[PDB]
Amino acid sequence: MIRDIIRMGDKRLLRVAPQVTNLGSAELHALVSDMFETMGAAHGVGLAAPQIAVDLQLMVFGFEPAVPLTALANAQIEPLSDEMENGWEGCLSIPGLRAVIPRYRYIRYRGFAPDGSPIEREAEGFHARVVQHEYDHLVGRLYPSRIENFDTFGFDDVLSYD
Amino acid sequence: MIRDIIRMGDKRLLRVAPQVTNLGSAELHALVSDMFETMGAAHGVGLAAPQIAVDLQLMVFGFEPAVPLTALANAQIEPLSDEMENGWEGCLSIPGLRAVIPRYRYIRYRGFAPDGSPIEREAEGFHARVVQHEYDHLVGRLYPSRIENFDTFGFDDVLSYD
Ligand SMILES: CC(C)C1C(=O)NC(=S)NC1=O
Ligand SMILES: CC(C)C1C(=O)NC(=S)NC1=O
Prior knowledge:
The structure is a homodimer.
Chain A: H1 26-41, E1 46-48, E2 58-63, E3 67-79, E4 84-90, E5 97-104, E6 106-112, E7 118-124, H2 125-138, E8 154-155
Antiparallel strand pairs in A: 1-2, 2-3, 3-6, 4-5, 5-8, 6-7
The complex binds 5-(propan-2-yl)-2-thioxodihydropyrimidine-4,6(1H,5H)-dione (2 copies).
One 5-(propan-2-yl)-2-thioxodihydropyrimidine-4,6(1H,5H)-dione binds next to strand 4 and helix 2 of chain A.
């Protein structure tokens, strides 16, 4: 079942989401199903549970470099060095827009697959950026607050910057 | 003649516009005509020449508190105190969006009416904010770069903040 993606300015994107506590359950499976489905319908590479107004530390991400299709509960992130990298990010809570955002090039993330199995990965580049971006959603941060160069912020169909 | 309003992300909104040097002329009158017309069609309270891709220190503004209908060339602004005031601002180069932006509560602005007569005014509150906002356009600054509180940034139809 496809869910409405809420847009920037919604108070619900600004919350700090509580942990998931129903790993392995049918409700959680149903919710992640919806998430992958909602993510695909809107052509996303990542979708955070608060983006569909579900107050939970949950995210889906991935696509066929490649990023494996992943559903991740109770994510926690650790930078693995100090190297930052700039890259384009947009939001499906922010459609038509994008900026360049600096992110850690290298991370580890830890949490749980929906069935309860632990997931820990080192990720880098785009993979890392996706996870940092979705993680922001879980603590009520959005990308505009992370823009260092405002010349790069603007609408998708218009934007001209390197 | 109504003109296309260019959107955020257009390189042309980032320029520093040269001065107007054809005061009193038919071309300038025609251009300001267009500006008022373009401003009314898009329901604006202010319109800067770079917003229609005309690289010039020119702006139109006003509506029937009230702000007198004004066309202003070669604007220069001076804050009259240090008091800042927060208020909602959106852009017609940025449609569907708004944030709260701090601006000087009190200013003087100086320049020229399109016929060459000098214009100098003290303005305050909304009047002042409009002029500061349009002025930003003339130096290639947009409101997002002026947001201090990102909880207030979002889409018009959605936004919930005081
Ligand atoms: C970084 C990636 C392109 C990213 C994004 O920009 N926007 C949403 S909504 N999810 C994401 O994972
Ligand atoms: C401050 C005023 C509401 C303002 C604006 O927010 N956006 C445009 S495009 N012009 C303006 O004068």
